[PDB]
Amino acid sequence: MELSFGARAELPRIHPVASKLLRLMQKKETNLCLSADVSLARELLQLADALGPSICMLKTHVDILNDFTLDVMKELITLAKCHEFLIFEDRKFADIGNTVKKQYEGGIFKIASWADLVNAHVVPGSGVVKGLQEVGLPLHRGCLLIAEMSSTGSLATGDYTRAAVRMAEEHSEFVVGFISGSRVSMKPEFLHLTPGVQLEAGGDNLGQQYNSPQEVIGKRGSDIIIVGRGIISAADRLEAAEMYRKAAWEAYLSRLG
Amino acid sequence: MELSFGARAELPRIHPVASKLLRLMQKKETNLCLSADVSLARELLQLADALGPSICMLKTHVDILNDFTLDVMKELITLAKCHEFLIFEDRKFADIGNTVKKQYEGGIFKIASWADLVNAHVVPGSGVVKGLQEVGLPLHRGCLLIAEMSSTGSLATGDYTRAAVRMAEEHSEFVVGFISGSRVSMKPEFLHLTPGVQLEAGGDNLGQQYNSPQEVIGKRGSDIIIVGRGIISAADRLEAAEMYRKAAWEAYLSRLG
Ligand SMILES: O=c1cc(O)n([C@@H]2O[C@H](COP(=O)(O)O)[C@@H](O)[C@H]2O)c(=O)[nH]1
Ligand SMILES: O=c1cc(O)n([C@@H]2O[C@H](COP(=O)(O)O)[C@@H](O)[C@H]2O)c(=O)[nH]1
Numbered sequence: 001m002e003l004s005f006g007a008r009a010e011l012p013r014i015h016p017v018a019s020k021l022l023r024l025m026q027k028k029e030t031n032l033c034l035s036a037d038v039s040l041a042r043e044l045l046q047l048a049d050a051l052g053p054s055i056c057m058l059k060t061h062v063d064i065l066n067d068f069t070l071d072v073m074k075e076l077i078t079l080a081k082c083h084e085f086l087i088f089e090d091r092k093f094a095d096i097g098n099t100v101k102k103q104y105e106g107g108i109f110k111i112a113s114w115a116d117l118v119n120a121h122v123v124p125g126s127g128v129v130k131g132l133q134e135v136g137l138p139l140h141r142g143c144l145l146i147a148e149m150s151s152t153g154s155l156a157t158g159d160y161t162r163a164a165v166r167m168a169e170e171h172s173e174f175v176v177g178f179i180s181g182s183r184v185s186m187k188p189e190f191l192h193l194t195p196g197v198q199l200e201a202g203g204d205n206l207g208q209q210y211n212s213p214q215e216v217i218g219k220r221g222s223d224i225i226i227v228g229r230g231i232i233s234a235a236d237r238l239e240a241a242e243m244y245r246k247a248a249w250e251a252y253l254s255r256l257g
Numbered sequence: 258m259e260l261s262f263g264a265r266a267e268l269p270r271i272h273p274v275a276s277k278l279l280r281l282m283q284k285k286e287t288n289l290c291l292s293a294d295v296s297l298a299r300e301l302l303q304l305a306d307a308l309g310p311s312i313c314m315l316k317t318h319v320d321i322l323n324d325f326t327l328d329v330m331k332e333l334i335t336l337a338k339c340h341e342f343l344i345f346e347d348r349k350f351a352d353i354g355n356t357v358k359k360q361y362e363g364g365i366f367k368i369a370s371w372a373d374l375v376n377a378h379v380v381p382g383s384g385v386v387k388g389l390q391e392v393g394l395p396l397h398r399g400c401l402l403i404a405e406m407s408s409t410g411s412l413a414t415g416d417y418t419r420a421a422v423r424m425a426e427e428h429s430e431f432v433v434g435f436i437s438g439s440r441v442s443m444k445p446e447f448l449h450l451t452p453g454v455q456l457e458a459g460g461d462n463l464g465q466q467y468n469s470p471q472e473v474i475g476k477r478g479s480d481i482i483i484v485g486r487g488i489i490s491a492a493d494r495l496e497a498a499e500m501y502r503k504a505a506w507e508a509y510l511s512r513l514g
Contacts, residue, residue: 037359039359039363064359065364066363068365090352094349094378095349096406096408096463098461098463098465099294099321102294102296102321103318103320103321106323107296107320107325108322108323108325108365109320121351121378121380122412123378123403123412123413123417124408124410125406125408125409125411125464127410127463127464127465128408128464130463130464131463131464149380149382150353151381151382151384152382152383153384154381155380155417160417163412204355206353206388207381207382207387208353208354
């Protein structure tokens with residue numbers, strides 16, 4: 001009784017950030033998250049502008065931006081609103097609750113002020129979520145839990161993955177889904193986002209492993225593909241994004257029947 | 258056949274950063290790491306100056322410093338050299354190798370340029386270490402692996418902890434020890450640093466749990482205590498640091514016999 005993204009956006013227990021996302025995914029016919037893994041603000045912004053219409057989400061690693069300022073993030077928000085995508089800061093909070101609350105709100109980055117979504121590892125126990133929530137709930141943000149990883153030797157398997165799912169389902173006022181390689185929850189209110197995606201077989205030199213959009217979305221039942229180098233390293237990043245968008249979208253449609 | 262810190266500093270397989278640390282621990286009679294969990298540079302630096310003689314290490318969370326600049330870190334290095342302690346940036350790298358390499362070297366923080374030590378979660382698999390190593394080995398840095406956590410519901414137990422130990426022992430050119438609640442490796446070349454430490458019983462509201470220096474160092478066989486609030490929240494932070502230093506040092510001596 002699989003529901004479309006648009007119908008999932010209306011589920012009783014849907015989080016507002018999840019709903020906004022699902023609605024724009026349906027509107028734009030995209031379930032592609034760009035992993036904007038660049039070190040220059042101008043490149044980040046030029047990618048966001050050009051690729052904005054093709055993506056549901058732009059994932060950042062703010063801590064690799066050589067020329068980060070809060071003004072850069074203002075500009076990114078303008079593009080996100082214009083083109084209709086969410087901003088996901090891929091910070092992988094992974095500390096005790098008291099620490100992560102400060103890392104989310106404060107410092108130079110002020111992540112909570114501009115990021116629609118963040119994520120967290122579940123290794124510390126649920127305090128990591130509780131700490132983040134203290135900041136994120138008042139700011140109407142959402143969080144993704146890392147239930148599985150794409151890299152060689154990942155320990156996010158078995159009972160670890162199950163613990164992630166339980167933690168999400170117990171903190172559904174804030175947690176909107178997962179970073180995972182497959183569908184890990186049977187509850188349609190939760191988003192599944194899958195990195196480690198390229199059209200061609202392969203990996204990198206540092207433990208990354210790739211699977212295709214058809215595999216991830218079609219066979220493994222995930223919702224969204226997260227793609228970095230498969231787009232960013234291409235000559236024509238717009239065409240690359242469109243190829244990935246079309247692949248992910250068709251895989252979704254076909255699964256829906 | 259337990260060895261003193263000074264003797265461990267000379268072990269054939271010791272890492273140079275571990276050796277430097279162990280030597281200054283023995284010289285200064287301190288196995289206390291201050292967790293300098295403050296948001297103001299002036300406070301960070303005033304603590305580093307006053308408490309420097311009492312500590313073997315100062316642990317930072319750079320990403321909570323409201324007024325971070327690289328010049329602040331220059332000033333911290335000056336104090337570290339004057340008073341003889343290492344700087345440990347508690348970044349908890351926890352991504353694929355290709356990402357962490359950039360997060361360690363680059364961005365605004367340029368962590369590798371000033372931090373003697375960093376740490377990593379083992380959840381991604383060994384690529385996290387391999388990526389960090391690409392930056393850290395040329396810069397003569399060291400890394401600690403998070404084998405156990407102090408917080409309620411921690412998943413860093415059992416086979417996860419064992420995996421951390423194996424990963425360390427397989428990357429001994431870069432990995433110098435662990436963040437853990439107890440001795441997890443039988444190899445004396447590896448450092449054990451233990452957070453979740455206060456003199457009094459208790460915890461916090463967000464999953465932290467405390468054990469005493471005598472428990473951690475004496476009974477559980479760790480090397481170094483990491484103390485935040487037990488010092489930072491006290492009126493007289495110098496006296497507090499001295500209490501913690503004396504507690505940890507005596508526990509070590511007694512275990513040594
Ligand atoms: O399991 C995971 C979780 C991630 O967030 N990521 C992230 O997704 C992106 C993958 O990038 P790429 O497509 O270039 O391999 C990176 O930013 C990485 O940090 C991942 O690769 N695997
Ligand atoms: O298992 C762990 C690992 C940590 O690094 N930490 C860190 O050690 C410090 C503990 O601080 P405190 O003593 O104030 O509870 C924090 O900076 C926290 O991020 C921890 O508490 N538990």
